[PDB]
């Protein structure tokens, strides 16, 4: 019952484009940290963006794994 | 090391007296001192020679 | 005289134009006494010397006679902060040092090469209990070398030659090094931690309102 609706969920096209928008913000951010000028000025930017990406990426892969035990291994 | 002596500079600081009293052995300090007088823009021809 | 290879100035990061015209920093409640407001002198330090924050620093000198340079010094020496500043540490410690008795520590007295006692001299008879204190002496045998923080700034150094078999002169110089490298430290209350428990239970919480969005149509 909460299984469905949360797969449901999983092929949200809200979804996929939060997780292609959150990788490329990371992208451009990890981009803009090569230079120790834009790391200094905007730095809380650059901290709290990187705990807000890794916090997505751990709770997409948590709930991922949660819709599904054993499958969820099979996928590359 | 500092900004060396000029024409200019010297017209600017004694204008109304004629160019052959303007610049002077009395008046002439090295930019060589490093601690002499300032450090004005670099680049520049350099007048003595 | 320090050796001073690539200095602040010439490069992209400060201006020996700016730095005549009362060039100055402060201090953010952090080095000693509070907010310390220094004007630079640059008729003396000149265009300071530039250390990245990050790799144990020990400066580089070299002994002049007659006007002309005479070798390396390579005897023992201290250094020490004219402002207050705090931020800095040695790299290594009275036990790791090769001394057998309680070295001498800043803290204690200023310093000289008359009053400086070596420790490497085996004396037992007032040092018989001591801690791995840290050790100050810069060269000589030990391979001691300075650690700087997070403060991102120029220091302004008094180096005092303290072997005293070396010469009868008190050897000393001043000298300003600019460090470039840490960043603000501000983790504060929010920890690593303690930020994916409160950010995933932000998101179960959007699954917890979800449950209701599924059961009510
Ligand atoms: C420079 O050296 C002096 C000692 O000549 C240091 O003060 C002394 O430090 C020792 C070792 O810490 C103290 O002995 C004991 O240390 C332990 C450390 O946990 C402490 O718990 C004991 O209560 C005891 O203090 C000794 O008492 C202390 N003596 C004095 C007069 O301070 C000093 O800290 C060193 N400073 C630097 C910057 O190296
Ligand atoms: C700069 O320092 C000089 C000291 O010779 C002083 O006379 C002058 O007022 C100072 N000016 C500023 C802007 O700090």
Redesign the interface.
Known sequence: ??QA??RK?IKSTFFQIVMITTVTTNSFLLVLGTN?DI??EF??TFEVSE??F??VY??EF??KVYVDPITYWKDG | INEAQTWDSMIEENPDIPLDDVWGPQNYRPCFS??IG????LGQPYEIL | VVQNKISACTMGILN??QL?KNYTYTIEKEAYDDDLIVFYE??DL?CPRLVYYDKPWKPVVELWKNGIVEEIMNAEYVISEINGLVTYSYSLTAATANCRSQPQNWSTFLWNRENYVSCHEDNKDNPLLWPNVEYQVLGGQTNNKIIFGQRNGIYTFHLSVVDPYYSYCNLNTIFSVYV?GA??V?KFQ?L?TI??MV??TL?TAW?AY??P???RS
Not at chain 2, 38 to 41: A, S, Y
């Open positions: 019952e909460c609706y949360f969920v120790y790391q200094f730095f809380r705990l807000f890794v916090s751990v709770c948590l709930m | 490093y601690a300032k450090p004005g823009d | 020996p134009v005549q640059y008729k000149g470039h960043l603000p501000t929010p690593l930020l994916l950010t995933t998101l699954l979800a449950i969005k599924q059961l």
